Design a protein around this ligand. Structure first.
Ligand SMILES: */C=C/C1=C(C)C(=O)N/C1=C\C1=NC(=C\c2[nH]c(/C=C3/NC(=O)C(C=C)=C3C)c(C)c2CCC(=O)O)/C(CCC(=O)O)=C1C
Ligand SMILES: */C=C/C1=C(C)C(=O)N/C1=C\C1=NC(=C\c2[nH]c(/C=C3/NC(=O)C(C=C)=C3C)c(C)c2CCC(=O)O)/C(CCC(=O)O)=C1C
Lengths: 457, 457
């Protein structure tokens, strides 16, 4: 059973059930059926029974042909074919994962996307990704054009911050609907397995959120004694918790393009529609490759950006050391506040103590902080938050130096599963926390302390 | 008739013919046949005749359905369909240009490419473009991964200097064949029309070089009284001049992927084959989009690179001005080989002159040159090639400054058309010529002279 105590650790990769707008058949390395969704009979003619091998008179030759390329091919298998199976026309989408071949049969609604039509869906959106250098403009434009293409009632862009939280930084919507721009949610809203998954699969599609699921039996794969890993499964079922959530939001369909940098989920477009919605495989695949393209683009953009700040920041420090290694009045040289310490690390106020002289840029607290480093009389550095009249504190020793950051930063069945009810849960994590001290800030204060450890007279 | 005098003016966009590995039908905006290749009957079993309208019984319903969505469309029409006609299965590629509908029939000789397989070609190759942050690692890698994909037996990469000349900066070949790296050709080797084109069309495919062409009739479009524009036409016809060339090279097939920065041809991968070869539409359409991605990835890398040189460069001047303006010894500040003016513009030698005192860093050519501008006694700036013993000369007045570049830089049926033969007619135009003075170099000397216009004492 699934609750708020239990959402942190839920195995959404091996649910043992899909969604009903398709069917699933799992087969082993020799094509023998190991398991099938329970609507196979309802969607198609056959009764896929463990032990059986698929036959032309069940699934068509196109599928068998396809599946064969798979069983004899060597590496990971991915492929599809547009086959008529008796009731309807189908997109049969296969892959192998672990030591299992999945054959997901999703429903087609005509007609064939020309290869060409497919190439300019891709090229149309990609094109929107390469007009801009700013990362914000980039997100803002794609968010827009995605909606034009999909028709989704709402297209959104989320950024993820080092602390694994989330912000909505772009939007294009139906105006009947509330705006989300600026909203903030915690890491806890996307459990490690959702996340680790959004990285693995560029795209997710949820078609009906109040869909009532469809199980695969057996729930457990005889060959391996473990359940089936539907990680790469298209129709893989959605967790119930996130379903209670989207319903509290009044949303019936979902769709997510991923944006990945380093080995990490850096952001993601999440499309919403207020009635059920299905984006056909071929078109998903467009946006699949878009996701590959967008991710690289952002990586280089963001490394260039960061490298810059990193340089102006280091170029500052060095400027300051050369200005002191060559300057007397180390206090006054540290001090034309504009050349000052507070100009090196992002803070709200800072402090330069040495000898019996102080200056509170942007004195008394200094005899209290040195009095809390009384029990660690050999610390040359100090870093904390959540604390006088400031919670963010970073301290270096050579005389000392301090930088400060305050913190004025900024139905259902369960409580917190709501847009504003997640933002409220957020505030708590942040009401006693200043902007944390980047890897960089620890390096700067560090290189600085050393730099001033060179000065002799 | 086409000669070496007639190479640069040849209209290769309006040949009135195509390659024979397919057939072409043109139609006015209402479907009526305006012209067709002289090989339709042979290939297809129709006699597409001006005045006719195509009918299901010759072209299949699939085409007509396509064509109709074109006629009743609004914008630039592009699309295609994999129909079977009487003898063969076909890739039928259509587009509208000017006010005409081209229907090109290219013989299909494979199994269908799954939308999935297609996407992995796209993604495989794209992944290559995104591994590297260096522009040369980039070319080198993709240049390789392309051959693995296509199987072409020689695939090269070309960069294009500002004078629109060429240079093979990467390669991957069948060992039996001579290597090409470092090779250089003139602008003349690619006339502004072929270049205009490669910019318009990501991809060109030459199927057989000694192909003996197939004409379209009438040669001239009655509606317009002009010839048909076959840019954007896939089966368009190759110039004979370039055909003689590839043959003098012992090359039978071709294919090129464009790389475009600014509105300009920045480089392009060219694929060669010592025997006939033919990439299918759909695959070409993977590389089409690849080309789009690759072009962008390159544009941003190069603007970053250049944005950087341009900064280290400017930061230099500024450094230099503050050193001169803030010391009394200018000669000593302006000629310190490290604070050197020689450090500002990329040269082989330089010179500082003011009063009766000079210094030849890295002097006689100067006596002649200050004698040249004797007939122009109100110039404050000078620049030239191809000229004593140094040909590159740039001079600024304040008191004078000079920068120098010597230029030690570095069968058939027609005279020149050959690899080592275009390089021979490349040299004779560059020998007198020193590395030309960049747009950037004229801005640096100018800024400098102005900066020094500043010093009062
Ligand atoms: C403890 C488990 C979960 C909590 C708590 C929760 O809120 N969701 C939990 C499970 C899953 N969430 C999944 C995706 C997801 N969750 C969010 C969180 C939000 N916080 C907000 O304030 C808002 C909106 C105002 C949201 C949506 C987001 C943004 C996402 C990504 C997809 C989306 O944006 O719709 C998730 C993955 C499900 C799947 O698709 O398989 C699970 C499970
Ligand atoms: C003045 C007209 C031409 C001269 C001179 C000539 O050499 N070719 C002329 C016509 C065309 N050339 C086209 C493409 C093209 N030409 C070159 C020139 C080279 N210089 C070299 O050193 C080498 C090889 C070592 C070559 C090939 C190149 C590189 C290219 C691009 C295509 C390729 O690399 O194979 C051209 C376009 C024809 C078309 O495809 O429509 C025309 C016309």
């Amino acid at each position: 059973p699934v609750t708020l105590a239990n959402c942190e650790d839920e195995p959404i990769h091996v649910p043992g059930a899909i969604q009903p707008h398709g069917a699933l058949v799992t087969l082993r390395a020799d094509g023998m059926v190991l398991a099938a969704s329970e609507n196979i009979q309802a969607l198609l003619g056959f009764v896929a029974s463990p032990g059986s091998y698929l036959t032309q008179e069940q699934v068509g030759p196109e599928v068998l042909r396809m599946l064969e390329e798979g069983l004899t091919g060597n590496g990971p298998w991915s492929n599809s074919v547009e086959t008529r199976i008796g009731e309807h026309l189908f997109d049969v989408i296969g892959h192998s994962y672990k030591e299992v071949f999945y054959l997901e049969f999703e429903i087609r609604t005509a007609d064939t996307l020309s290869i060409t039509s497919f190439t300019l869906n891709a090229q149309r959106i990609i094109a929107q990704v390469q007009l801009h250098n700013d990362t914000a403009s980039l997100l803002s434009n794609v968010t827009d054009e995605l909606r034009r293409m999909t028709g989704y009632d709402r297209v959104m862009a989320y950024r993820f911050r080092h602390d694994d939280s989330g912000e909505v930084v772009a939007e294009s919507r139906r105006e009947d609907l509330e705006s989300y721009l600026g909203l903030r949610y915690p890491a806890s809203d996307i459990p490690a397995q959702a996340r680790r998954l959004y990285i693995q699969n560029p795209i997710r599609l949820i078609a009906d959120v109040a869909y009532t699921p469809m199980r695969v039996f057996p729930a457990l794969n005889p060959e391996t004694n473990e359940s089936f890993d539907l990680s790469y499964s298209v129709l893989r079922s959605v967790s119930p918790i996130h379903c209670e959530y989207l319903t509290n939001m009044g949303v019936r369909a979902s769709m997510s393009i991923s944006i990945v940098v380093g080995g990490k989920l850096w952001g993601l477009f999440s499309c919403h529609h207020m009635s059920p919605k299905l984006i056909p495989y071929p078109v998903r695949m467009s946006f699949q490759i878009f996701s590959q393209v967008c991710s690289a683009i952002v990586e280089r953009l963001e490394q260039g950006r960061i490298a810059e700040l990193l340089r102006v920041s280091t170029e500052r420090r060095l400027a300051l050391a050369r200005r002191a290694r060559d300057a007397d009045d180390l206090f006054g040289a540290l001090a034309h506040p504009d050349d000052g310490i507070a100009a090196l690390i992002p803070c709200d106020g800072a402090l330069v103590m040495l000898g019996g002289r102080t200056l509170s840029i942007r004195e008394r607290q200094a005899g209290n902080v040195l009095q809390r480093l009384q029990r660690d009389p050999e610390r040359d550095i100090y870093h904390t938050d959540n604390w006088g009249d400031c919670c963010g504190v970073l301290a270096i020793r050579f005389g000392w130096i301090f930088w400060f950051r305050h913190e004025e930063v900024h139905g259902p069945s369960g409580p917190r599963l709501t847009p504003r009810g997640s933002f409220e849960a957020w505030e708590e994590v942040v009401r006693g926390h200043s902007t944390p001290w980047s890897e960089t800030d620890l390096a700067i204060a560090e290189k600085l302390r050393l730099d001033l450890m060179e000065l002799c007279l």
